[model samples]
Target: KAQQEERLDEINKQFLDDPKYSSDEDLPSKLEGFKEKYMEFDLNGNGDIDIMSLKRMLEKLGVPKTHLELKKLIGEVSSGSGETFSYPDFLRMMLGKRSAILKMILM
Candidate 1:
């Protein structure tokens, strides 16, 4: 069913509408707490994260994701010629983390 595909992006849209993340300030500054972590994840000094680096962020997050799922996730978050996750990609991914049911059901 389309419920499979309907799950992921919908949750993020609702989360972005929530008061907790009402300000752009909240979104950008939220990553300030993860700056050091993001730095290490931005291996190669490219200012972005590829699969291996993505694994590091997820590891620290205790997300328990492996290669196949990570690859699919990367494909979902990244755009043309972008083999890595930039701050925007990371932010979108982060926004989607607000609900465990979204994560579990999508999985």
Candidate 2:
């Protein structure tokens, strides 16, 4: 679990600081904000984010929790004991959808 959290942190840093994504330098702070938001979903204080927790968090963030398409995309990115989120898994999904992320940032 600790390892996975480390992975999550690492990915957050990687994506937020990467020149390709952070061209404006505001990305790091934005990423930090998102990280805090993610941490709030880590209920049970287990130090790991499970799928259910993530879904709840996403919904809180105004993401579509009930949408099958959104769920499918999120499901593909989530994995851990009890189907929790792993850093590598999330990272893979994020990197795979970099174009989408870029679009969001650009907009």
Candidate 3:
């Protein structure tokens, strides 16, 4: 869809233009931070994060969300049966930095 492509272009442009991404150090540091947070949130040792765990994690990060909002976000980022967000899904979500930044901005 045209809208989807436009959004994708915007995301790509944001990533490309970000000075943080220009540095090999910053990107990896941010990704490491993401991984550390991911590990903390991936409760039950399942290697995937369910909505509940994600909710708790976000709350801990001071980004509270209603159940409906969290559900919708997880659904958007999930790559599987919409049950949970796998590591790959989290990676994609973090890499674009779109969802994360938007959510933080909203808070």
Candidate 4:
């Protein structure tokens, strides 16, 4: 079975424990919010976030349709197997590139 629903908050906290995001302002509060919402929707608790969960998360963040775009983005960011997106990886990609993705966010 999926992890205990009670652990959702813990899972979110663990996900955000990466050093790059550890210092981000409001991260604690944001994590608190996302933890509840993610678990409510993930009902399956599959650990590996699937497409539906991904789409829901992106929607919650006000990101535009990320379908194929996300696939490409993942390809760009991943260095190898098990290299799924994490807080540090996200920060590195966002800060290091500062290209179209960042530009879009800025614009």
lDDT of 3 by residue, 25-83 (tens): 56645555555555666444446778788788778778888888788777887888876
Error of 4 at 89 (Å): 7.3
Models 1 onward score TM values of 0.48, 0.46, 0.59, 0.39
Q: Sort the predicted structures by lDDT, highest score first.
A: 3, 1, 2, 4
Instruction: Enumerate residue pairs that collide in model 4.
Output: none
Identify the superior model by TM-score, candidate 2 or candidate 4: 2
Expressed as tens digits, the lDDT of each residue in 1-107 for candidate 4 is 24464555555556577675666677777666554544443333333344455566567668855577656654554444432443333334543434635224422
- Across 39-69, the per-residue lDDT of candidate 1 in tens digits comes to 5454544456688777776787678677877
lDDT of 2 by residue, 1-107 (tens): 44445645777877865666655556666665555545565644545556566566667657645545444544555564434554444444444444443124222
Best by TM-score: 3
The better candidate by lDDT, 2 or 3, is 3
Candidate 1 vs 2: which has more lDDT:
1
TM-score of 3: 0.59
RMSD of each: 11.7, 5.8, 10.6, 5.9
Output the worst ten-in-a-row residue range by lDDT, candidate 3.
1-10
Name every residue pair that clashes in candidate 3: none
Better by lDDT, candidate 4 or 2: 2
The per-model lDDT (C-alpha) reads 0.54, 0.53, 0.62, 0.50
**Best by lDDT, which number?**
3
Give the winner by TM-score: 2 or 3: 3
- lDDT winner between candidates 1 and 4: 1
